[PDB]
Chain A
C-alpha cells in the first residue's frame, strides 16, 4: 500500500504518523521497519528497530 507513495495516518492516540516506503524501505515516523508484515486476523504486526 505504501511502496512508492507516502501516506499520513492518525493513530489511536490523537497524534499523526507518516508511513512511507522509498527504495524498498518502509519507515513509520522516526524508526525504520525491521520485519515487514505479520498477519494476525485483525490487521498486521510490523516490527521496528526502536521506540517511536
Chain B
C-alpha cells in the first residue's frame, strides 16, 4: 500500500501532492514574536478567512479585540477563527447577503479548507442552521473532529491538497471555489456588482446543479482560476494544463478539419498500440542465438596491468557492470530521447494537442449570427 489514508489519518498525502509547491501551508505565531511575525500570521489568517477579501482599517477595528487576544497567545488560533467568524464583519461579507448553498459552502472553505462532499452533508449543516443559528453553525464547523485532527489548535486553516479526495468532483469544486491568488470572494460572486456603491450585494451561487445532481464543473473553471495554477510547478508536459485562449475569427470549416483530424489520430493510435503487443522480442531470436553460442564468444579475464597483457583481453577493473554487455553512455541515455523516436509516444501527444484544440473550437463555434467570417 502506497498510502495509509485520507487527509486526516496520515500526512503522506501532503508529501507528494501539489501541497508542497504551494503557498497553502500553515502559519504559526511562534512563542514571543515581534510585530513582523504577529503581522505576518494575522494577515495570512485574513487572507484565508476572508478569501483575499478587502478589509479597510475601519473594519479592522471590528475585529480588533479578538486580534489583540490572539497577539497575546491567550486565545488558541481556532478560538481566534471562531471570534473572526462570529464578527459582524464576517457576517456582512458572507452571512448577510448570501443564498444558503453558497453560504454553507463558504464556511466549508474558510473554516474547513475543503469543498463540500455531498448534498446530504450540505443539508445536514443547513439543518444545524435552522436549529441554532449562524453561531452554532460556526461552532459546529470549528468543533469538528476532522477539523481538530487536521489543523490542531495552532494552525490557521489552509487549502488542503490531500491526494485522497473522497469525490473527484469535490476536488474540481475545491479548485473552483477558490479562484486563484488574484481573485477574491467578491469577484467570484457578484456581491459588489449587485450591491449599490460596492455594498449590500447579494451573493451569487453556482454549481448548485452539481451539488444536487451528479454533475461536473468545467475544465475552464478549474483551469483558469485555481490554486492548481497559482501553485504552478513548471511542467514540461507536452500536455498543456493551461487552456489555450479562445482564438477570434473562427469558421466552421476550421472545425470540421480538426474533428476529422482527431478521429484519424485515434484510429492510428489504436492500430499502433495493437501492434505494440506484437513486437515481443523481435530481437529475442538473435539474442537466443547468441545465448546458444556463448562458449565461443564469452571470455575470461586476464589479471594484469595496462602493460603486459595480450591486446583485447579484459582486466578485472574493466569489468564494468555496463561494459559487460557492451553498452554505452548512449544506452543509459536512451529513454530521454524517446518521445520523438517512438511512434506510439509521438501519437499520444498529438492526440492530446488535438483534443485541447477541439475544445477551444467548441467554445468558438458557439458564437453565431454576428461573426465576421474569415
Direct contact of A and B (CB under 8 A): yes
In the complex, whether B311 has a CB less than 8 A from a CB of chain A is: no
In the complex, whether B245 has a CB less than 8 A from a CB of chain A is: yes
State whether B245 touches A25 (Cβ < 8 A). yes
Q: What residues of B have a CB within 8 angstroms of the CB of A34 in the complex?
A: 247-248
In the complex, whether B240 has a CB less than 8 A from a CB of chain A is: yes
State whether B242 touches A35 (Cβ < 8 A). no
Q: How large is the interface on B (under 10, 10 to 19, 20 to 34, 35 or more residues)?
A: under 10
Return the chain A residue nearest B241 by Cβ.
A23
A47 and B250 CA atoms in complex are apart in Å by: 13
Mask for A17-32, Cβ within 8 A of B = 1, else 0?
0000001110000001
A34 and B247 CA atoms in complex are apart in Å by: 6
The smallest beta-carbon distance between A48 and chain B, in angstroms, is 10
State whether B247 touches A35 (Cβ < 8 A). yes
Mask for B49-62, Cβ within 8 A of A = 1, else 0?
00000000000000
In the complex, whether B244 has a CB less than 8 A from a CB of chain A is: yes
In the complex, whether B136 has a CB less than 8 A from a CB of chain A is: no
The smallest beta-carbon distance between B232 and chain A, in angstroms, is 8
Return the chain A residue nearest B356 by Cβ.
A24
Return the chain A residue nearest B248 by Cβ.
A34
Q: What residues of B have a CB within 8 angstroms of the CB of A35 in the complex?
A: 247-249
The smallest beta-carbon distance between B193 and chain A, in angstroms, is 24
Q: What residues of A have a CB within 8 angstroms of the CB of B249 in the complex?
A: 35, 47
Q: Which of B54-93 contact A (CB under 8 A)?
A: none
State whether B247 touches A23 (Cβ < 8 A). no
Q: What residues of B have a CB within 8 angstroms of the CB of A24 in the complex?
A: 240, 242-245
State whether A23 touches B248 (Cβ < 8 A). no
A32 and B242 CA atoms in complex are apart in Å by: 16
Q: What residues of B have a CB within 8 angstroms of the CB of A36 in the complex?
A: 247
Q: What residues of A have a CB within 8 angstroms of the CB of B245 in the complex?
A: 24-25, 32
Return the chain B residue nearest A34 by Cβ.
B248
The smallest beta-carbon distance between A23 and chain B, in angstroms, is 4
Q: Which of A1-52 contact B (CB under 8 A)?
A: 23-25, 32, 34-36, 47
Return the chain A residue nearest B242 by Cβ.
A23
Mask for B247-269, Cβ within 8 A of A = 1, else 0?
11100000000000000000000
Return the chain B residue nearest A24 by Cβ.
B244
The smallest beta-carbon distance between B224 and chain A, in angstroms, is 10
A28 and B244 CA atoms in complex are apart in Å by: 17
The smallest beta-carbon distance between B239 and chain A, in angstroms, is 11
State whether A47 touches B243 (Cβ < 8 A). no
A24 and B245 CA atoms in complex are apart in Å by: 7
Taking A24-B242, A32-B245, A35-B249 as given, write out 15 further A-B residue pairs in contact, using a Cβ cutoff of 8 Å, ordered by the A residue number. A23-B240, A23-B242, A24-B240, A24-B243, A24-B244, A24-B245, A25-B242, A25-B245, A34-B247, A34-B248, A35-B247, A35-B248, A36-B247, A47-B248, A47-B249
Would you mind naming 18 contact pairs between A and B with Cβ atoms under 8 Å apart?
A23-B240, A23-B242, A24-B240, A24-B242, A24-B243, A24-B244, A24-B245, A25-B242, A25-B245, A32-B245, A34-B247, A34-B248, A35-B247, A35-B248, A35-B249, A36-B247, A47-B248, A47-B249
